[PDB]
Symmetry: C3
Subunit: 559 residues, 3 copies
C-alpha cells in the first residue's frame, strides 16, 4: 500500500547456540548430505544431460541345414533329401525381429477341391446329419458340405471344399528337422543416434574380424552370434526348443558417455527368453505359423502349405547417451540445497524434545548419561516466547502465599475469582538490571465490591489464599503503590507537562497504581494488563485517590 | 574462520501462540495433508517400485471362407469357387500386428510385355504426341512407349511395357468377398517380463478352455477373439470396413502388483480404431496393398497380382508391475514432509493480514463478526520487530505537545529540523518494570545555534511545536537530566573508577545528559541514538556542564 | 500431551528492516522469479496436461522401373528386359517401415542337387582331404560332400549338396539397376490418437491435392514423398546409396495443442539417415537380404534366389498433445512458490557476510564504495542473539581495568581463575531506561580463600588485573551492594512478606548482593549467573552479612 511498506524486508530472528554438540552434529549432517549428493552426481552422472537413442537394426542369418525325410505327395511316399539356406528357413522380416525355422510340417500338392476332413480332433460323422453345409469352425480345414464321405476304411468324416489333401493334424516332429540351426550364425548391425548430442555410432568397429562369434568373455563385441550359444548363455536348449519353437530376446544396451575426457559408447549384449518356459503340460506351447508357397502345374493353382515352428529373435535396443550440461548440474545443485536442512531439523527436534520437563523427573534417574542435556531447556527458553491469546475472559491472579500466578481464562459466570482455579503460569523474573472480612477474604482488609452482582465475581479476590498478613500492610506497598511522589514522577515521565492540580488527576494516579501493583506481582506486561487486583489493595488505592464523581469502575479489556 | 565460529548453530526464534483457533486450524490442515498423502500412497501405490514390462506377442488366426466369383484370365471369364484359409488371407507378419484380408482384386496371367494402359484416370491418347517414351507417373502401370495403340474399339491409350494385361483400375467389390472374416478367430499369446522384479506371466492360464471366445463380461480372460466381436465392442461394422479395410488396435494392459499379500497380474483387453472413421467422402480411405504370387508356365515368368484390402490389427501391450520398495516409500514420505507447511503459511497469512490497521476502522464496522480477530495485532507485535536502516540523515524528534516521535530521515539541505516534517513513529512504552525566541521557537528558552550556517539546520528545534510551557522548566528535567548526582551515579555504573575531578569529566556528564533526555522522550535506544535534542534543553545542559575548551559540537553519527 | 499443548501454534519471530536496498533487491528477485516462471508456463505450456499419441502408419509406394540386363539361366546368357512395379520392388511389410529394392542379384533355375562351391572366398580344394563331408560354415552355400570336383578348367572346389547352380559371389552392380527408384513416390497415412484428450487426427486433410509431392517450403503437408527428394533434403545421394542400400528415417512430429483458442495439430516431417554413412572402406556396408521365389517346372521344385539391396525407410511418429488442466497449473504454481526464497537467501547472505567484523578494518580501506554497508552489522545485532551453552566449567570474570568480560569456560584444574585467560566477551549495554595481598591480588583487599585447595582456584580472583584502586572502595559499591536498605527492598519486591529478623535472612541478603555485583558488572543475566565475584568484594559482602553457621560456600552451578 504505502510507499514505506514497499521497501521493507523481513529476516527471521535467530539464536546462535555456542555448543560443540550442535556444531559437531550440524557439520556431520551437512557433510553426510554433501557426500551423498556428490556421490550420486558422480555415479549417476546427474551433471550429464541424457538423451535416448534412435536405433536401427539390420540382421543377416547364415548357415545351411540338410533334412532327409519321407514326404508324401500325390499318394506316393518317397525319401527326399533337402537343403535349407537363409532364403529357406528365414522369413523376409526386415526390422528388429528375425525368425529361424527350426521345424516344419509341409503338405504338398494341395488343390482347391472337395475332400474329407482329416479325423484328428473328433471329426467323426456317421450320417449327413452330423455335417452342416457351409459350416466352419476354427478346427475346420474347409467349408463343410452337407454330405459325409469315407476318409478311409472303417472311418468316416464330413466332406469339405478346401485345399486337398487336407492338412493332416500331426504333432511337431521329434527331433527337430532343422536342429542344425543351433550352428547358424546371425549378424546384427545396430546403428544408434543421439540427435541432441549429434552423435552416431555402430556396434561394428573398424578392424573387426569377420570370422568371429560373440562371447561374453573372449569376444563380447562381435555382433555375430551363434544361436546355440545364445541359448546356452541363459541355460536354454536349442534342440528342445527347436521342436515347437520359442521367442528369444537380444538386448543391446548402450550406456554411452559422450564427454571427451570420459568417452565410452559400446554395446552390452544380453539374452532373455521372451516365451514361456513351456513343458509337456502347457497351453499353446511354442511358436508356429502357417504360410504357403503357391505354384501351378497343368494349368491349375496348387500350394505347398508349411506349418513352420521356429524361434523368433526379437531385438531390444535401448540406452542413454550423456553429455555434460551446466543446466543439469545447476538444477541438481539447486535440488540438493534443500537437503541441507537435515541439521536444523535434527538439532531443533533434540532441543524441543529435551525441553519437555517430563524428561527431568522421569528419564534422568533411569538414565544418568542423558542428564546434562537438560541444557536444551535453556535453549528453549531463549528460542521460544510463549504468548497467550488476549481475550476478555483472560485474567491473572497472584497470591502472596502462592508461588506464581494463576491464569484464570475461564468465564466466572458468577463464581468469585477467588474461588475459581486455573492454569499455574510461572512468575517472570524481574528486570534486575533496574534492581541492581468477606467469605472469600483471608486478610481482613478486603471490602465488599460495588460492581453489579454479576460483575463483582471478578473483583471478589484476596491478596492471599490462606489467612495471614495482608500484602497491603507491606512496607513496600506504600513505597511503590501509595507513594504519591512516585506516581507523580511516573506520570511526568509519561506526560511531563500535565496539570499538577487537575480535577481528574487523582484518577490518573489510581491507574498508575493499578499498573504498579500489576507490575510488582505480574512482571510481564502482557501478564499485567489482564491481571486483577485484590479487593484490599484496590480499595486502599481508591481511599488514597478517591473519586467524588461516582462509583468506581473496574477491570476493562486492555485492547 | 575461528574455531569458536565452527561449533555454532542457529535456531530460529519463535513465538508459541496459545490460541484454540490456530491449534485447530493447524491440526485440521496437517490432518488434511496427511490424509491426502496417505490416500495417494495407498491408491497410486507410491510405496511400490514400478517397472515397465517387456512384451512378446504371437498371434494365430483361424477360420476359412469361400468366395464364388467371376474371374477373367487369358481372355476367358469363368465362375470360380475358391477357399481362403489362414495361409491365404494372412500375411506372414510375425510380431505385434497381424493382417486379415477382407477383400481382393487379383489380376491373373500377367506377363512382362507390351500392352495398352487401362483408361481409368484420363489415360486417353489420340496421337503418339500424347505419349512420352520411357515416361512414368505414379498412376502408370508401366513405362510409356512412344506410340499409341487401341485398347479396344472407340478408345485409345498409350502403350506401355509392363505386366500385361495391365491392372484394371476398379473399386473394391461390394459386398466384401471375405466378409465371412467377421467370424474368424484370433488367438493372442502375450508373455510379459518384469526383469527388476524377476517376474514372468502370460495371458493364458492353466485350465483355459480352448473352445472359448473373449467376452468382456462372460469371458474377459480368453485370448481368443472373434473379429466381428472386436468391432461390435466399439461400434464398428466389420462388413462395411471389410470392403476397403482399416486398422484396429488391441490394447493389452497389465496393471500388476507383485506383492504377495496383494497379488494381481491379469491382462485387460480393450479395442480401439486406429484408422480414420472414413466415409464415401474421405481421402485415402481404408487399408490396401499390392503383393504378387509369381509362377511360370511354358517357361516364362508370370504373376497373379493381388490388391488386398483388409484390417491390420496392431497390438499394443503396455503396463507396469509394482513391488514394495522401502526406498520409494521413504522418498515419498520425504517429499510429503514439505506439504505440512500449509498450516504455518495459512495462519501466518491470517496473522499478517488481520494486523494491517486498515482492517480495524473500515472492515469491522461493516462486519462485526470479524471483530475480535484484531487479536492478531498482538501476535504481530510479538512476532515482528520493525528496525530502521541507521543512516546519517536519520533523525528523530519529539514535541511535548505532539503525541509521538517524528522520523525525519530526509536531509535538511538547510531547512530547519523544526520546519521539516516526517514519518510519525509511535513512542515505545517505557520499561515500567523499572518505574514500578528564534523564529522556530515556541518555548522562548531556545538559544540560536553555534554550528556552521549549513549545519545548524539540524539544531534548529524547539521542545514543542506550539507555544506553551517549556519542557526545560519541568521538575523532572532537573531530576533526570541536570541532576549532577544522577549523572555521576550513571557514569560510576559504567566506569566505577573514573576520576571525579577530571578536566573533561564535564563533557562526559553532558553526553550522559544527552542520553538521558533521549531515553526520557525516545524510549527505544535505536530511536534514541539518532534523536535530536531541542536547543533549549541542549543549551541548559551546556550551561550546567560548560566547556571552556571551545565551541560545542553537535549530533554525530552513532555508528 | 496436555490439552493446553495441543492448541499451540509456533510462528517465527522476524525483524522488518526498513531498507530501500532490501526492498529493492527483494522485489527485483521476486519479479525475476515470477517472470521466469510465467515465461516457462506460457512457452512450455506447463498449464497443459500433455498426453503421448497412439500412432498408426500405412504406406504405399508407387512408381515403376525398367531394367535391361544380361541374365544367365540353364547355361544360356540372354539380354532380358524387365519391369519392376510396387509388387516387385517392395516387400509386403505392413507397418512403420517399408523397403524399396534398389538393386538385385538373382540366381535362376536353382534345384536341390550336387554342385561345386563357387570359388569366391578361398574355396579352393586340390584333394578330397580339403573337404569335410557334412561340413558347413557361414560362407557355405551347401553341405560339403567329401569329394572334390572341378568347377571349371584349371580350377577345383569342394562338392556340396545345395541349390544349384550355386549362388555366385559377386558385388552389387554399379550403377544400381533400380536407381530409377529415386523417382518413386511414397504416401504415408498417419493416424494419431490422444485417448485422454479424446482427440483423433490424420496427416491428410480434406482438399488435399493427390498430384502433390512433399516440399518443406512449397508443400510441407503433402504426405506423398519422392525418395530422391527425401535423400537430397539431408544431403544423401540415392544413386550411390542405391547400389548397396541403406536405412532412412522419416520422423513425423506432432506438437499438438488441443485448446480451442490455441488449436494446432499438424505433422512436421523430418528426414534422418539411420544407416552408417559408409564408404568403400567400411564393414558390412549397406542393407541387403536374400529371399526366394519358388516354382516348379517338369515336376521338380526350383527357385529364383534374389539378393536384394535397397533402402528400408523406418517411420518414427512421435509427439504430445496438450490440453488445459487446472491440476497441472496449480501444481506448477505450487512448485514455483518455493522459487521465491531467492530474495530472502540473497539478502540474508549479504547481512551475514557484511557483519563479519573483518570487513571493516580490511575491506573498507581498500574499497570505500562498500563502506556504509556496515549497517548490516546493526541488522545482525537485532537478528541474531548469541547464547552460550550453560555448563559447569563456564565462568565469566570482569576487571575494572579491563574493558569487557572474559569467558573462562576452561576447567581450572588448580590454576587460579585470575591467571586463567579466556574469550573476551563484550559487556552488554545496561538497560538505560532504568538509568534515565595474595600473589594474584592487585588491589590488596582480597582475602585468601577458604574453599578446598582444589576448589579455591575459582575464588582466586582480583577486582582488577593491574595494581590500582579497589572496586570495593568505590562509592557505588556501598550504594548498590552493601546497602542493606536496597537489598531489603529487592527482597521485598521478590517476597514482600518475608521475616525481617529471620535467622537466615543474612544469607538471602548475601545472595542478593552477589546478584547485584553480577548485574553491575555483567549486564546480561545469562552472563551474570555464571560470573565469579572477586575475593575482595565477596569477603566484604560476607563481613557485612556474616554467617555464624559455618564456612561460607562458593559459586554453585546455576541450573
Ligand atoms: N490490571 C488491572 N487493571 C485495572 C483493575 N481495576 C481497574 N483497572 C484499570 O483501571 C482503568 C480505569 O479504571 P478505574 O479508574 O478504576 O475506573 P473509574 O474509577 O471509573 O475511573 C481501566 O482501564 C482498567 O484497565 C484491576 O483490578 N486490574
Ligand atoms: N542524540 C543526540 N546526541 C547528541 C546531540 N548532541 C550531541 N550529541 C552526542 O554527544 C556526543 C558529543 O557531543 P558534544 O559533547 O556536545 O560535543 P563537544 O562539546 O565538542 O564535546 C556525540 O557523540 C553526539 O552523539 C543531540 O542533539 N542528540
Ligand atoms: N555469580 C556468583 N554467584 C555466587 C558466587 N558466590 C556464591 N554465589 C551464589 O550464592 C549462592 C549461595 O552461596 P553462599 O551464600 O555464599 O553459600 P553459603 O554461605 O554456604 O550459604 C549460590 O547459589 C551461588 O550461586 C560468585 O562468586 N558469583
Ligand atoms: C519424534 C519424537 C522422538 C522422541 C525422542 C525421545 C528422546 C528422549 C527423550 C528425553 C527427554 O525428553
Ligand atoms: C502428526 C505429528 C504429531 C507428532 C507430535 C509429537 C511431539 C513430541 C514432542 C516431545 C516434547 C518433549 O518430550 O519435551
Ligand atoms: C512420541 C512421544 C515422545 C515423548 C517423549 C517424552 C520424553 C520426556 C517426557 O517424559
Ligand atoms: C537417535 C535417537 C537416540 C535416542 C536416545 C534417547 C535417550 C534419552 C535418555 C538417555 O539416554
Ligand atoms: C531425535 C532425538 C535424538 C537425541 C540425541 C541427543 C544427543 C544430545 C543430547 C544432549 O546433549
Ligand atoms: C493474499 C491477501 C488476502 C487478503 C484477505 C483479506 C482478509 C480479510 C481482511 C480483514 C482485515 O485485514
Ligand atoms: C507478488 C506478491 C505481492 C502480494 C502482496 C499482498 C500483501 C497483502 C497483505 C495485507 C496486510 C493487511 O491487510 O494488514
Ligand atoms: C490483496 C490486498 C489485500 C488487502 C486487505 C486489506 C484489509 C485491511 C485493510 O483495509
Ligand atoms: C478463506 C477466506 C476467508 C476470508 C474472510 C474475510 C472476512 C473478513 C471480514 C469479516 O468477515
Ligand atoms: C486467508 C485469510 C483467511 C482469514 C480467516 C480468519 C479466521 C480467523 C480470524 C479471527 O480469529
Ligand atoms: C558465500 C560467501 C560469499 C562472500 C562474499 C563476500 C562479499 C564481500 C565481503 C565484504 C565484507 O564482509
Ligand atoms: C559447506 C558450507 C560452508 C560455507 C561457509 C562460508 C561462510 C562465510 C560467511 C562470511 C561471514 C563474514 O564475512 O562476515
Ligand atoms: C568464502 C569466504 C568469504 C569470507 C569473506 C570475508 C569478508 C570479510 C572479512 O575479511
Ligand atoms: C554479487 C557479488 C558482489 C560482490 C561484491 C563485493 C564487494 C565488497 C567490497 C566492496 O566493493
Ligand atoms: C553475495 C554478496 C553480495 C553483496 C552485495 C552487497 C550490496 C549491498 C551492500 C550495502 O548495502
Ligand atoms: Zn482479603
Ligand atoms: Zn489483603
Ligand atoms: Zn524553544
Ligand atoms: Zn523549550
Ligand atoms: Zn585484590
Ligand atoms: Zn579489590
Amino acid at each position: 500500500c504505502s510507499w514505506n511498506d514497499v521497501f521493507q524486508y523481513e529476516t527471521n530472528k535467530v539464536t546462535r547456540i555456542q555448543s560443540v554438540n550442535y556444531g559437531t552434529i550440524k557439520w556431520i549432517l551437512h557433510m553426510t548430505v554433501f557426500s551423498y549428493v556428490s556421490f550420486a552426481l558422480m555415479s549417476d552422472k546427474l551433471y550429464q544431460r541424457k538423451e535416448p537413442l534412435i536405433s536401427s537394426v539390420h540382421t543377416k542369418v547364415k548357415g545351411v541345414a540338410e533334412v532327409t525325410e519321407n514326404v508324401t505327395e500325390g499318394g506316393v511316399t518317397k525319401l527326399v533329401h533337402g537343403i535349407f539356406d537363409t532364403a529357406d528357413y528365414t522369413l523376409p522380416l526386415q526390422g528388429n525381429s528375425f525368425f529361424v525355422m527350426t521345424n516344419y510340417l509341409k503338405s504338398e500338392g494341395q488343390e482347391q477341391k472337395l475332400c474329407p476332413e482329416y479325423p484328428s480332433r473328433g471329426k467323426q460323422c456317421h450320417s449327413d446329419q452330423g455335417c452342416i453345409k457351409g459350416w466352419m469352425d476354427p478346427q475346420s480345414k474347409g467349408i463343410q458340405t452337407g454330405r459325409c464321405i469315407p476318409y478311409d476304411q472303417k472311418r468316416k468324416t464330413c466332406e469339405i471344399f478346401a485345399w486337398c489333401p487336407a492338412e493332416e493334424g500331426k504333432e511337431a516332429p521329434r527331433p527337430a528337422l532343422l536342429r542344425s540351426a543351433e550352428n547358424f550364425t546371425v549378424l546384427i548391425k545396430n546403428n544408434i543416434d543421439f540427435p541432441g548430442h549429434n552423435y552416431t555410432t555402430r556396434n561394428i568397429l573398424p578392424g573387426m574380424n569377420i570370422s568371429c562369434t560373440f562371447h561374453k568373455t573372449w569376444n563380447p563385441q562381435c555382433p555375430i552370434f551363434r544361436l546355440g550359444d545364445i541359448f546356452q548363455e541363459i541355460g536354454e536348449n536349442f534342440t528342445e526348443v527347436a521342436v515347437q519353437g520359442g521367442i528369444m530376446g537380444i538386448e543391446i544396451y548402450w550406456d554411452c558417455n559422450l564427454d571427451s575426457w570420459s568417452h565410452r559408447c559400446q554395446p552390452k549384449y544380453s539374452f532373455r527368453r521372451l516365451d514361456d518356459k513351456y513343458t509337456n503340460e502347457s497351453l499353446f506351447p511354442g511358436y508356429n505359423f502357417r504360410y504357403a508357397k503357391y505354384y501351378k502345374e497343368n494349368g491349375m493353382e496348387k500350394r505347398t502349405l508349411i506349418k513352420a515352428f521356429g524361434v523368433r529373435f526379437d531385438i531390444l535396443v535401448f540406452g542413454t547417451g550423456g553429455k555434460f550440461d551446466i543446466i543439469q548440474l545447476v538444477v541438481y545443485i539447486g535440488s540438493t540445497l534443500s537437503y541441507f536442512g537435515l541439521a536444523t531439523v535434527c538439532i531443533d527436534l533434540i532441543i524441543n524434545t529435551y525441553a519437555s520437563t517430563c524428561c527431568r523427573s522421569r528419564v534422568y534417574p533411569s538414565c544418568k548419561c542423558c542428564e546434562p542435556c537438560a541444557v536444551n531447556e535453556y535453549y528453549y527458553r531463549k528460542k521460544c516466547e510463549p504468548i497467550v491469546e488476549p481475550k476478555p475472559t483472560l485474567k491473572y491472579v497472584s497470591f502472596v502465599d502462592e508461588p506464581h500466578i494463576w491464569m484464570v481464562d475461564q468465564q466466572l459466570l458468577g463464581k468469585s475469582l477467588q474461588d475459581v482455579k486455573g492454569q499455574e503460569v510461572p512468575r517472570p523474573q524481574t528486570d534486575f538490571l533496574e534492581l541492581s472480612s468477606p467469605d472469600w477474604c483471608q486478610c481482613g482488609n478486603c471490602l465488599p465490591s460495588q460492581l453489579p452482582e454479576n460483575r463483582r465475581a471478578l473483583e471478589e479476590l484476596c491478596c492471599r489464599r490462606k489467612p495471614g498478613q495482608c500484602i497491603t500492610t507491606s512496607e513496600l506497598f506504600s513505597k511503590i503503590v501509595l507513594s504519591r511522589e512516585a506516581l507523580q514522577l511516573l506520570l511526568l515521565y509519561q506526560e511531563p507537562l500535565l496539570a499538577l492540580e487537575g480535577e481528574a488527576i487523582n484518577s490518573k494516579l489510581r491507574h498508575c497504581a493499578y499498573r504498579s501493583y500489576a507490575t510488582w506481582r505480574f512482571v510481564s506486561q502482557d501478564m499485567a494488563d489482564f491481571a486483577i487486583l485484590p479487593s484490599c489493595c484496590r480499595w486502599k488505592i481508591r481511599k488514597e485517590f478517591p473519586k467524588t464523581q461516582g462509583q468506581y469502575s473496574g477491570f476493562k479489556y486492555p485492547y
